[PDB]
Amino acid sequence: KKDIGIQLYSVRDLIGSFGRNQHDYKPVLKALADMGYTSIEAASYNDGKFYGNTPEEFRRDVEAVGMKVLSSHCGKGLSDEELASGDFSESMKWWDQCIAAHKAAGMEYIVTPYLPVPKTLKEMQTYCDYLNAIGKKCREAGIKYGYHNHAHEFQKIEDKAVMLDYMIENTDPENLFIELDVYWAVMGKASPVDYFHKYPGRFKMLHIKDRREIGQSGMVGFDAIFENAKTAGVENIIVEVEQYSYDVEKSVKLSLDYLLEAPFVKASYS
């Protein structure tokens, strides 16, 4: 028995994602709960609602099956006009709605799942200003704002700064943490542990992800990752499975069991 979360993207084939393919998510929530997942990270926020439901109903539904309503992936990128002007004030109204909806749902974190590699350091800097501004507003609402990587953030901008490094270095720790996707970090030739040591404390959440089932490909050193979890600053871990050797239910269950069986995964990080 360990505190292990689940990215609801993992079951998007059953409940949908990012505003589409919707089903009644409640039976799946129950199965995930019964498997022994203890928290959820959502993957379908839109216009004040979660999977089409009010924050109150979503919170109730998640609470009904005994899981923590922990985190949520959602975001709003800057238009080319906002990037060129450096003025992203119109975007902030969307965040007032988003932050109030997350607070009503009980959420502890909000994580932006994706930003494009910008063309220039100046653009990156504007993104940093935006991330700081979002994270500050989140912080005032009692929420921790984070960023989730794929592999593209390990590229360089203007052949100077690695994008993820720039973001980390040019955001305030209390405004932005990194929800590090260890699979995608490895895919971008990055050492998760080396990142942990370069930016201690900034990795408040991990996406525990692999090619398919967690711990099956040989491509991720979860032992080392979890051994350096204190340096990283890990508070919570979120299993993500996007591709499957089996039916989805079994893939996500085997994924949890790997962590439950792993001696290097502690019962709680919080």
Ligand X SMILES: OC[C@H]1O[C@H](O)[C@H](O)[C@@H](O)[C@@H]1O
Collapse the DSSP code of 56 into the 3-class scheme (helix H, G, I; strand E, B; otherwise coil) and give the result: helix
Q: How many helices (H) and strands (E) does the chain have?
A: 12, 12
Binding-site member from 217, 243, 268, 270 for its own copies (CB under 8 A) = 217
What is the CA angle 36-191-222, rounded to 5? 25
User: Which stretch, 18-26, 59-67, 105-113, 222-230, contacts its own copies (CB under 8 A)?
Assistant: 222-230
Binding to Co ion by residue 61, rule CB under 5 A?
no
Nearest-approach distance from CB 59 to Co ion, in angstroms: 23
Out of 1, 80, 89, 140, the residue judged to bind ligand X by CB under 6 A: 140
Nearest CB to ligand X, comparing residues 170 and 231: 170
Cβ contact 168:131 at 8 Å: no
- Asked whether position 191 contacts its own copies by CB under 8 A, the answer is yes
Q: Are 73 and 44 in contact (CB under 8 A)?
A: no
Specify the residue, 204 or 209, whose C-beta has the smaller distance to Co ion: 209
Q: Is 153 in the site for ligand X (CB under 6 A)?
A: no
Q: From the CB of 20, what's the least distance to ligand X, in Å? A: 25
Interface with ligand X includes 73 (CB under 6 A)?
Answer: yes
Q: What are the angstrom distances between the C-alpha of 29 and each of 15, 58, 76, 198, 229?
A: 9, 11, 27, 37, 28
Which C-beta is closer to Co ion: that of 207 or that of 253?
Answer: 207
Structure tokens at 178: 């990194």
Q: Binding to its own copies by residue 260, rule CB under 8 A?
A: no
Cα distance between the two ends of the chain: 15
Shortest Å distance, C-beta 226 to its own copies: 9
Binding mask 89-128 for its own copies (x = CB under 8 A): ----------------------------------------
Least distance CB 253 / ligand X (angstroms)? 18
Rounded to whole angstroms, how far apart are CA atoms 98 and 64? 23
Site residues (CB under 6 A) for ligand X, limited to 176-215: 189-190, 198
Task: Compare residues 8 and 237 and give the one whose CB is closer to its own copies.
Answer: 237
Interaction residues for ligand X, span 108-137 (CB under 6 A): 113, 121
153 touches Co ion by CB under 5 A: no
| By CB under 6 A, residue 33 contacts ligand X | no
218's CB contacts (< 8 A; 6+ apart) are: none
Read out DSSP for 171-183?
S-TTT-EEEEEHH
**Distance (Å) of CA 52 to CA 17, 67, 102, 133, 229:** 10, 19, 14, 27, 35
